[model samples]
Target chain A: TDFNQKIEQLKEFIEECRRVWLVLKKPTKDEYLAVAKVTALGISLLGIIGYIIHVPATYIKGILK
Target chain B: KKLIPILEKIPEVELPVKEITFKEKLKWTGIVLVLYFIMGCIDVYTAGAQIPAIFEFWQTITASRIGTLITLGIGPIVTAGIIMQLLVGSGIIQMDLSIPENRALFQGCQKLLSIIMCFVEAVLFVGAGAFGILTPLLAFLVIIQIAFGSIILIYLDEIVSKYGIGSGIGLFIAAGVSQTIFVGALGPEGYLWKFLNSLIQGVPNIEYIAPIIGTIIVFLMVVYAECMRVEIPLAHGRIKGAVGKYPIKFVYVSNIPVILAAALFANIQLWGLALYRMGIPILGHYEGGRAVDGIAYYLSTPYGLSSVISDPIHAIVYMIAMIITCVMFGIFWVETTGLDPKSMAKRIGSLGMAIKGFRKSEKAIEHRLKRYIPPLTVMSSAFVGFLATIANFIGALGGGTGVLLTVSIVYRMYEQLLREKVSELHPAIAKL
Candidate 1:
């Protein structure tokens, strides 16, 4: 309620897109494959964060070096 | 030239290269490895916590009825695998979907049958696990339920395969492993903790460390044995050209044998235990058929396998009967289930090739397999048995197989990820 109107509207839009299914028609096999491909790609993203986590938290600076 | 023929069938599939660089490829592989490692660690931690409890609870309900438990344990995997192998072996199931409509329909029927069987098996398994009363009724109900559940699971897997990441089987296995680890660790500890605290004092009351380690060592030994191979050189009728011999994996039977043996042992053990508990002499502790004594005890316990090891006696002698059972079942698995001999024969014969120093008939092929398969089973079983024997000792110090599986699977996934990433960078590197 206290947030700026523009920022609040952006936040709501973001939430809706991420949380809700927005498909327009019955998804074809190609569409399904595309989704799988994208999900697999998402794992690559996690791979980066995973590396950082594996690095000892206390030796963060040392790892960077 | 090859592209034109392939493109004529399915022209829709297209992949393109963006950035082609060695560094990019390395980055991709690194990412997969890291992700895999993380997932593995989580799975191990979870499994470590949960497995002991599952074992304990299973122990309580199944008790001396090891045979029944083995039947239940092996049912889902064996039944599913058998059906798949058969369908694939027959002309019923194929990857090609561009066949005539009638042929497609037949394929659909085969698929439907498989689905129904899977569902039925699942239902029976759940019912058996949850409800011990009215077992016969439960078995009937389970078959009926599996008929439906199999199709649903098939559809679910298809969705995941088509729309989700990784493979459906891989995902399913991972999910099951994850659940086991999570549930095994979290659920059992409460009861285990109570039992531990009630009897022993001091220490954190950790009870499952040994068993977990034991299970892991056993798993690794089995995997190693399964990985072992002997070179079986290929030869044509006349010595025209000499191609390098392919190293045939000697113990390719893998964990399937161990599972089969364990299931049988469990069945016998359970009956013996039940009879003993009920105070029936001939049936329970009986030395023969109705009675189970020396051989039975040896068959059922780690000490029983003392002969299999090379101390006072050989591990082979200690485990002769069990090895025989494994070999018999291995052949039974190949012939009845149609997994091994048929596939090997077909592959060998398809290219008009024959094993060096052997006749080319189906009977001859089967005979050859029969000779080698026993030694394979013995070698594999011995390793599996020994590992299982010694695992508990090591597991006491640290966790074992559960951790290894979780780690190995995660590592495998990471390797896939790295391959993909590297592929993106250098398209040429990605080509099979």
Candidate 2:
């Protein structure tokens, strides 16, 4: 009988979730590009930096013999 | 109690006595990253042959390159993070972060905790016989090197946060996960070539297409969510149209909850692996090494859609588990990290910005903020969890959590770079 009352709390939470999506702003094309370019730039730079480090570390390991 | 001072002297990086230039900061950033990567590539010399991975997919999120010197990666620091957060959140520590003295004490205690966890996690992996059932002497050497590697990571993390750019762990994660996705997409056995082969066969194998498709879609969703915010209109008290909107992001606590939750799952998996090795079927029963039964099955991240269709219960249970963990972590994160309504209210109101049509008082501002912050926190936390779980099922290139971590970590660094640029372009706004 009272189980429906407890369910009402969940209903309110779900409704608020819907309202949240309505008011939220998705990135425009320019916004997406700015974030995308920076992230891509940062990731690639770090990868290449590690690549540069990785080579020496790999080559020098053979000298331990 | 009686041990705070002892822990403080456990050897940590000393703060620089003088201010450093931004150029100097960049130099330290490069040097630290180089050091971290070098360690990541160097395997422990004594662990001759048994480099069997205990955490196959989770190595990406943990930022560990298993079988290497940096085998535990940022694991101990993250575990310590969760530990300290719980300590303070539960009032066990009896200190808040707001005071300067308390903040210093809190950080030192956390680093001390990091050191303790470094040894604990090292022993867990070594004692589990991950390195081919090593004899006692060899096991001792491996444990020593592994703990040393994580301890060095702790100091490197300090160096980066203080003398470099974005966080060290975030930088490591972004770097590692991107390589996994990027390199995974380009090789002979890469997703693109597999898709091409399937095309030539006159049938598009979903298996061939899913990883790339999932990664792209996950990247899009993460970037999309990264920008989602609720803009609350505000204006500078003294200047008209000096108007600025103070936005409370939908993801108010950011990607923090998921990282902590994933780290928790990672440690749990390591524990599961150890139990499996012992042939005791408590949390899970293993076939060869992977958990196939019991509660441990649901504790790990789901395999892909192929596995999901084969076992729906595992998929559903794991997905719900990840989501609820993120939600709870999100709630606790906000309370402990000052992202709660109270501090946000103080931050905005004390800075001379006030809500429109409301009296310019902190009480009113907090009341208004309460309307959005709590709800947004829960909604966004659940969304992160839901998206991460589904990304795994769809086969994102670095599993679900790895790509989620990569995307969020990248955006955080982007935010840092943008703020740096903002400071450069307008010095006056930096004060504001």
Candidate 3:
């Protein structure tokens, strides 16, 4: 009786999980654009910073090594 | 009735008296970050020889300073989090955080555990001779310094969480990693400068440029992941046309899974080293001060990208182990943190919001959420693990995990800044 009850609970859990998966929503086009735009902006920001703080040749190797 | 209540009774830092402006919060974050930087630079009074290479690897995640009072970094807090999470997960410490009192109790218990963990880790680190040779007096002083530094960090994190924008822990990790990446890429003491100098003298080697390229690629990838999310639409019950969308990012569990996974791995290695020193070779044996020919070797990150490139089987094993651990932690974190369907459903119900097509019942919302959250949790954790593995191979500046964390945290901070600005600009619209 206990074994059957446990199996039933497991089955129900799996069933619900499947239901939840089916209801998963995808992002809209505007949302996708927003993500892309921010990502691009972030990359550009990093590049600008890199340019502002240019290191002389071999400076990095000295610290790392 | 137990230690939980007593710990909960411990007083915490009070929040700001007045409603803090967006600019005020920004200033506080900046001040905290500056303080963190200063603390990192301050050397410990009793530090011995420089920390070992193994510690440098751990530093990517822990933000620890080798010979400074900040040597412990967030190790104790992360360890305490792991323990508390496990306890709550296993039904040992029953908590319903929906209850305000219970939530306070849980936070108090976590804080208490973190304090104890700081003391414990400080003793262990000193006792294990992790910092090489030390006299009794120096060792005592070192322990005190480490504990004090950790307590200060805990409060700093509290300050950031309550009064500053974004989380203190995330901010600290980002700062530490960003510093490492910046230094690695452009510092006078690093390779980039050396490469450039050599190039000027007609000895240019293209091979020297890989890490910089890798860092950029990793940064972009992290930003991309942060932006990838699915939106679930919800409608207000009492209002017309009051529709809103809640986003579940691809990294739904954020960086906590990786943090937990890395902490676990680091602890395992430390334990293996300590045990080996004690003449017990059950887990692994240290050779030339490194884990080799045991479980530790299999469990450890494959040293660097070259080693993995040279040995394909080792790379596969390492990646699999990391992904599995990350996934496990991801699931466990969501369950404990009330990000699970049941808790989220309760929250949504309380707000009088419902999924567009679903009934307004908590069970209905929970059932819908279960479909997305579990799979998303596993997939996102796997994605992070995969990215981390690749980043490590590419030799991304500040380590793969660290770079990923830095980008994600910065992106989050940017988003928070935008929201705060919007709310500040139009207070009437912000009420919506």
Candidate 4:
């Protein structure tokens, strides 16, 4: 089920992955998933905080009139 | 001689008082804010009121023949915009006047269309309502006059921007938001108390908490997304005609993609509304339809997403479909918009800047981009769309994507203002 064919060679993709690993140097699988999850969760959290403090405080005046 | 003396007596204004700097800035910001606030309020109010009136008006036209052409002609605009942005970023087009002249042409087209749209919307509103032909024609003439006057407002905005003051539109938007927030926060009743009262007032029990919680979560996520970056290594060889390490911004794609996506959905909304007014069986029960009794139901419910054949599933499919579309649009924008390698390489080649490792030929640069753009397009688009959908689905939920722009733009402007102020002050100003 991998979109292995649609992509440019599998070897090339692996090479790019290897290059990335070389740059980061020795990241575990957990470390990678952690980075991804944190990004998702953190962004969502930031959005919520901004809306709560700003959105309600800002747009309320116009709605009443 | 007496007139000259009287004229001289008019005292010249100084650059305001230091003791009242806070008051002065506040006053200026307030005056600008108020002007903005009023204009914004009128625009919003008129827009809201105009909707129902326009619906009635549309009903009078063709007596229900408008449904067939509802969602047509909107796709090209988005597709073109997507392609254009990509080209600009990729160095397909020069920042200054260049060959192809796509940007100017595109902008000119949008301006023309906007005027046409304004005129048409006015005419339709007038004609469809109780007003007869003459009044609608008169209204059309009046709108045309105001459209001319808008040129002056555009000049005013230019002057204000040149004055190195705050963003005029942002000030207006900020004022509008501030006004809305003020209203929402009124009295000794916080959101919690309001929800409890809604229950007592015969409101449903289960419908309140999601929005309150979702709003909090989404706002925070936007702040995080705006801060997030995935840097692409580049050199000035392509853009500046000199080779040095440069970072191609990842988040730039998010802004336009979301905007385009919203605009794309807006076309759908308009079509649905038009069809609903026409009493089209297939689309008549949409959120804005004649049968839709409750504003809350229309705004909050997920029914509209599942419209058309295989609709319920199709609606869920829309979320991912739009994501892919946004990403695809991002790549499409980079390419046809003229950021292809050859154009960028030419610019850099002329400047005598070359990427240190890559071949300096125009063909080589184009080749590199041809390789780079496709994957980058998908990856970045997917990332942005995922974050955006989740945040929206959680926070504002049904409130379209403009909220994303509003939040991100304000945050960015705030950061920029802080940076500017931080650079401009005497140390004493920081303490107070």
Candidate 5:
């Protein structure tokens, strides 16, 4: 009886987990655009920083070695 | 008052906390930040001539320099928190934090544990000879320096929690990560400059693009996640038209589980390295001063996209482990930290709010909350873990974990700033 009761409890726990997962929402279109905009700006920022630092390619290659 | 025996014995900071103006809070936060930066720059005199290269990867997470006074960083404090939370959650230490006295006692105990942990970790590091073999006097000094540095961190965290802005730990992490990311991307010595220089010379290697792209994506994703939440409509029990929405964020567990997970992995590596040094071949073996083919190596943070590509299997395993552990820690944190549905119900009841269809009693409210909180906690933790692993794989500048933490921490601080300013502007709203 105790073992069955424990199993029953375990089943209930799994049910709760499934219910929660079902409600999880996919990212909306607005969220996707927000993400894209941020990424583009971030990449641009890095590019500008790269240009600003402007180490010679020959020197950078030698250093990588 | 009969208390938990361990709680009774731990020494605690007894600060008489009082409401302070926003200006005072900002002053305290600034002071702590300045002190932390100064400590990071002050290298330890007793440090070995050379630090082992393996530990360098942890520098961003621990918020410490390799040979500095803050080398121990927030390791001891986070470890202590993990221990205390585990104990309380597992019922080994019964704590009802909803009660004012119990809450104080729990915080006091956690503080005490952190101090003890500082001493313990300092001694362990010294014994492990990570700082090189020292004379007894030198060793004592080294231990003292590490413990003192960590203790100061503990107090700084306390000051922030009590008088300043958002959590001191979070503030320190954001500060560390921002520095790392800035240096990694734009410093003359960093990869971004090298990549750009190479590109300009028309000899661009594809290797440098992944992390830059990954870092940008992760930052944006975290920002989106922070704002995403499910709002449950709530109504005032007595006052007409005094309705509000209680938001349960998608990252419901916040960045805490990731921090806990990072600390867990760090401790595992530390202990493994120490054991390997002791010639314990069973746990792990040191090869060329790097731990290899052990549990620790497998659990260690994946370096970047290149590593994940090279060893896809390992990446999968690492992600699975992180997600599982994060979910577990998330559940444990919510339960012990009074974010549990029962606790929330009580708090909401005290605030004179109720779910749209529920009676105003705590039990009724809790029943309504149970449908959302339990599943949200698990799913959000899993989401964070997945995000962290993906970020790490793509080689985000400060590692995925550090980036996740910094974004969340900064957002939280912004919210706190807004609250403070609003309170200042409308003194009457300060009471709420």
Candidate 6:
């Protein structure tokens, strides 16, 4: 009966996965490489300041002992 | 819009006459990010010291440094957007978003709604003994101190949007979790600190070892998971055969779904506390303002490997809840937030771009675009939820949820900053 609609819904998950496999951007090392470089810059520049503040809050808190 | 009457209270920043350069953008972003970290350490002026407790956990999610001026962090601003958008999505509030005039009105209302909410939430937290007992005058002042940060938060988000790369809200989040991870590993109370202490004592613990690796693994996965996109090549109308690629991201909706899902959990967290106050225990039980056990406990995230080891069932329930909510909200985001293929294609086509080798019609463009959108949307959103669960079991700072939001936001900022980088090939006058 209405259960016949079940098999056709297979079309939903079927072509979908195939589209993703092909459509998905590839190995993309370049994208990661570029972003990572910028992130490293972000991390170092931002990181040092946090470390600066971190010292007073933490390192000094311990020295408070 | 009429409901929120103080739309004019917080002042506005104007977009510049000419395009801003990359280094200048970075300069503005850097100043804001540093200001936020400074704000992170500015303790709230209170007569009685609020011993940071379980409320510290909410701080991780809110990106707030609890017991500070930014204590509520960006929670109210974020929740305001959630409230505004959900109403729009549910069709209760209707506005013509395509018109810039109404969009401005809508945005102003969102800001007004957020400020009022900050006061409401400040009063709520104070009432809940978050700041412990205080004299009545100090209580009102504490509310003012907390709510003032909320006003500053909206101001910060606006400036960053106009002058910086990525949203300031996202920047604050990444900054918070980044700080959490750093402090979580190296601070006096941190695991790596204990790991060192353990070695010195001649006894070592895997518990300490795991989070070190766990945080890095989850961070790398966020960047790697962020990699995929379905690139559609569109030819420019005036340029003839010259084509440019528009990438429809695999994580197309970005971290919006996960943010909303977490926002939902934040509200649910209060449900237990609020109901518990009324002698209702159906949601969960609260002890010293912590969700100790029950439905709310099950919905709450575990922070470390040890927590999961003690209660695997809690882990299972949280996984199901996170994944299901993420997937549900993921679908809603695309459907509601101008992310759908239909309105999306029109928006692009109006820029004189059309899908390569296709007849230049918005309808054709939309359908062509629709093929990979949904399947990727659901699958990618599910990956964040699943990965978040894995991060917790393996142990990560800022919890699994906070790390996901943090790293994903960093990935977002890097990509946007790179886009601005290309725009400058140049940094026209960006020094102090």
Each prediction's DockQ against the real complex: 0.02, 0.42, 0.17, 0.08, 0.14, 0.36
Chain A TM-score of each candidate structure, as shown: 0.35, 0.72, 0.53, 0.41, 0.49, 0.56
What CAPRI grade goes to candidate 5?
incorrect
lDDT of 4 by residue, B270-322 (tens): 44444444455343344433224222113221321111333345435556766
How does candidate 2 fare on TM-score?
A: 0.87
- Runs of candidate 3 with Cα error greater than 4 angstroms are A1-65, B4-11, B47-54, B233-246, B252-254, B303-307, B340-353, B360-362, B425-432
Winner on lDDT (2 vs 6): 2
Query: Which residue runs of candidate 4 sit more than 4 Å off their true CA positions?
Result: A1-65, B1-34, B43-97, B100-102, B121-210, B233-247, B278-315, B336-367, B397-400, B411-432
lDDT of 6 by residue, B1-432 (tens): 354345665678999978677778878888888788887767788767545364645675577776778877888876777777677655676666666666677777777778877887777666556776657898899889897886787788889999877888787777777777666777557788798889898898777867777777766665566666777787786577667887765653548777777777776776566567646687888786778888888887776544457887788888888887777676666545545675767676777577776767778778866765666667767767777666666666666667667666776777786666666664543420
DockQ (model 1, Cα): 0.02
Docking class of 1: incorrect
Candidate 2 stretches greater than 4 Å from native: A1-19, A55-65, B90-95, B187-210, B239-242, B303-307, B340-346, B422-431
What is the alpha-carbon lDDT of model 4 when measured against the actual structure? 0.42
Interface RMSD of 2: 2.7
Each candidate: what lDDT? Answer: 0.39, 0.73, 0.70, 0.42, 0.70, 0.70
Q: Give the fraction of true interface contacts kept by model 3.
A: 0.10
Can you tell me the CAPRI class of model 2? acceptable
Lowest summed-lDDT stretch of 10 residues in model 5 chain B?
Answer: B47-56
* Tens-place lDDT digits, model 2, residues B21-98: 567777888798878887877888784765655656557767878788888888888888887767775677667667
For A1-65, candidate 4 gives per-residue lDDT tens digits of: 36866465756744543442232223345644443354334333333333444444436644674
Of the two candidates 1 and 3, the one with more favorable lDDT, higher being better, is 3
TM-score, chain A, candidate 4? 0.41
Q: Is candidate 3 or candidate 6 better by DockQ?
A: 6
The clash numbers for all candidates, in the given order, read 37, 0, 20, 49, 1, 0
Docking class of 3: incorrect
